[PDB]
Structure formats: structure tokens, C-alpha cells
Amino acid sequence: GPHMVSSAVKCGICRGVDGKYKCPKCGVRYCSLKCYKDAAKHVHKESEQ
Ligand SMILES: [Zn+2]
Ligand SMILES: [Zn+2]
């Protein structure tokens, strides 16, 4: 029966596969270290400075 609610998330950086990995800094979900160690889509600006 319908008990599942899709208890998973997609990579918010490439939107390719599931975001199995998570960034404890911003709260983003990435599919792997590929999108983790990115500085184009994986933005760590936080504030202006
Ligand atoms: Zn981050
Ligand atoms: Zn990704």
C-alpha cells in the first residue's frame, strides 16, 4: 500500500541523482564529492562578507 513518501532527496547541485551526501555548512544535498567540492553551483557565500 501507499506508505512511502519518497524519503530521499536529489542532488540540488546537478539535479542528476539522489543527494546521498550532505553539506553541514549550508545544508545542501549533493550526489557525491563531485558536486561537494564545487565552487560554481555549490555556493558558500552565506552573507555578503
Ligand atoms: Zn555547502
Ligand atoms: Zn550532483
Rg over CA atoms, the chain: 13
Query: Closest ligand to 30 CA?
Result: 2
User: Bridge partners of 21?
Assistant: 30
CA distances from residue 31 to 9, 10, 11, 19, 25 in whole angstroms, order as listed: 9, 7, 5, 4, 16
Is 23 flagged in the annotation as binding? Answer: no
Cell of 33: 564529492
Can you tell me the distance from the alpha carbon of 2 to that of 8, in angstroms, rounded to the nearest whole number?
16
Run of H or E residues at 35: helix 33-36
Query: Closest ligand to 20 CA?
Result: 2
Instruction: Compute the C-alpha angle 6/20/22, nearest 5°.
Output: 110
Give yes or no for a contact between 13 and 30, defined as CB atoms under 8 angstroms apart. Answer: yes
Q: 9 C-alpha vs ligand 1 centroid, how far in Å?
A: 15
